Design a protein around this ligand. Structure first.
Ligand SMILES: [Cl-]
Ligand SMILES: [Cl-]
Ligand SMILES: [Cl-]
Ligand SMILES: [Cl-]
Ligand SMILES: [Cl-]
Ligand SMILES: [Cl-]
Ligand SMILES: [Cu+2]
Ligand SMILES: [Cu+2]
Ligand SMILES: [Cu+2]
Ligand SMILES: [Cu+2]
Ligand SMILES: [Zn+2]
Ligand SMILES: [Zn+2]
Ligand SMILES: [Zn+2]
Ligand SMILES: [Zn+2]
Ligand SMILES: [Zn+2]
Ligand SMILES: [Zn+2]
Ligand SMILES: [Zn+2]
Lengths: 285, 285
């Protein structure tokens, strides 16, 4: 309840600079890659085997898994710079802009811009531009650099709206059986974005494009964390609005999917991360 | 110093029954799969990216990474039955047999026998025969059943010998740069099996065949843990013989390979598991 996570639009130029520096430091030491890999491994970890669900997506653990992911990542930033916390990208607000690509989050001072079509959409601007930031493929081998292609697909030509967020917050049930891509009247599946997909969470990944548009490579793009800090914020809000409500399933959904089950690749359980304040952080506002 | 890890050949009928029983429960609960996944993930995690070294093999962390692996595995077994510890398969003595496939380790009440040529070398005997034990391919999808083909390979027709172990124990250095498959006069690379490969550990893997023969699927076979328990034991012996020799590299090795670096997929470091006695276990003898 001490660490404050801020809206990207509220950061001082120094905070932006420090965040970028710390990320680049984590990347140099080899710590950043551990994060890419954890998310990759989890994505291929089906619960149960053969099922469409995995440890981090298309199921109940989607939200708590990423919260732990972000928590661990933020603790790593703190180790380098104690004054650095994870900021959140409020995409619902950027969706209101005439041209979202002009949002300050994409400035050459922060995340860098959209991909360059003349270069097969390689990001050639910002601190994570090809040549300054190496990426790796799902195979785990060096790739050719970050790629982004804002709103190119037909299913995600735009960022989700404030209304989409509001409608999701309306759901009274955290999740509902079978606890997967098909769960109905489920806040979790709603936020994740499988209802009339792609929506919200899923839609943002698709809108961004490049490595961000697919599970095995998503974290190669630093914005992955700003996105999920926002997703984590929507959830924190949901938890306040419906305080009558608790995580689901409690038992008898799939192993690694239940309230007290370990979340591959960690021993962390959903219960362990239900209270973000106990985890040591809050969102401005 | 309380948990004793025993030679498979020193186990009672009951101790073997309980070990197998506990492994099945671990499997049934979904815990066993986490281990197959962890080992697979580590094998694809190169240190550094593009390199030939990975978090669990072909470099210095090979030994401490597997020691941590077994420790975690033994703790889970202990959680199911506090009287069960990890036994070790002393293959160097089995190598002396006229026909090693006749060793009591392969009895039907234990691990099971060799694969069935008619079935495409699917294991049809023992507690883990196809139909009684599910397996998972490199993709994380169900694979249809355990396979074994003892010494079918021209490269590893025989199990390593006592002489092979003894010679490795004479090595003075834990490891040597470049800290990878080419390291010379390295106890680690020797025990792993790359000096005139396939030797030792690498040779046991190749000799067993089936999922045990390849990195991404090896742990699917329970004997993987019995194998690595002996490898761990051989290392523990080396540690006592060369009491003034320590882990290498101490620093400036690839991140993930140094004495105090975290070992993907965990935060555990080689330092953390250098003394097995501190880990709560010892070998019988
Ligand atoms: Cl603020
Ligand atoms: Cl909140
Ligand atoms: Cl909250
Ligand atoms: Cl504020
Ligand atoms: Cl004994
Ligand atoms: Cl003994
Ligand atoms: Cu993802
Ligand atoms: Cu995501
Ligand atoms: Cu091995
Ligand atoms: Cu291995
Ligand atoms: Zn809150
Ligand atoms: Zn944690
Ligand atoms: Zn603010
Ligand atoms: Zn590879
Ligand atoms: Zn010892
Ligand atoms: Zn010595
Ligand atoms: Zn004994």
């Amino acid at each position: 309840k001490y660490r404050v996570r801020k809206n990207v639009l509220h950061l001082t130029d120094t905070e932006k600079r420090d965040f970028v520096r710390t990320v680049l430091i984590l990347k140099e030491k080899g710590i950043y890659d551990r994060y890419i890999a954890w998310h990759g491994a989890a994505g291929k970890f089906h619960t149960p085997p053969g099922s469409d669900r995995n440890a981090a997506h298309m199921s109940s653990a989607f939200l708590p898994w990423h919260r732990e992911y972000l928590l661990r990542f933020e603790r790593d930033l703190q180790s380098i710079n104690p004054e650095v916390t994870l900021p959140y990208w409020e995409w619902e607000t950027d969706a209101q802009m005439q041209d979202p690509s002009q949002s300050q989050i994409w400035s050459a001072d922060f995340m860098g811009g959209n991909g360059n079509p003349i270069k097969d959409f390689i990001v050639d601007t910002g601190p994570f531009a090809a040549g300054r930031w190496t990426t790796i493929d799902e195979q785990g081998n060096p790739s050719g650099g970050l790629k982004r292609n804002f709103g190119a697909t037909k299913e995600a030509p735009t960022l989700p709206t404030r209304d989409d967020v509001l409608n999701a917050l309306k759901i009274t049930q955290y999740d509902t059986p079978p606890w997967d891509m098909t769960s109905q009247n489920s806040f979790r599946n709603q936020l994740e974005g499988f209802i009339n997909g792609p929506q919200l969470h899923n839609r943002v990944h698709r809108w961004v494009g490049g490595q961000m548009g697919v599970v095995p490579t998503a974290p190669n793009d630093p914005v992955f964390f700003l996105h999920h800090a926002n997703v984590d914020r929507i959830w924190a809000v949901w938890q306040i609005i419906h305080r009558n409500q608790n995580y689901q399933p409690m038992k008898n959904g799939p192993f690694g999917q239940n309230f007290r089950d370990p979340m591959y690749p960690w021993n962390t359980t959903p219960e362990d991360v239900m209270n973000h304040r106990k985890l040591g952080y809050v969102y401005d506002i």
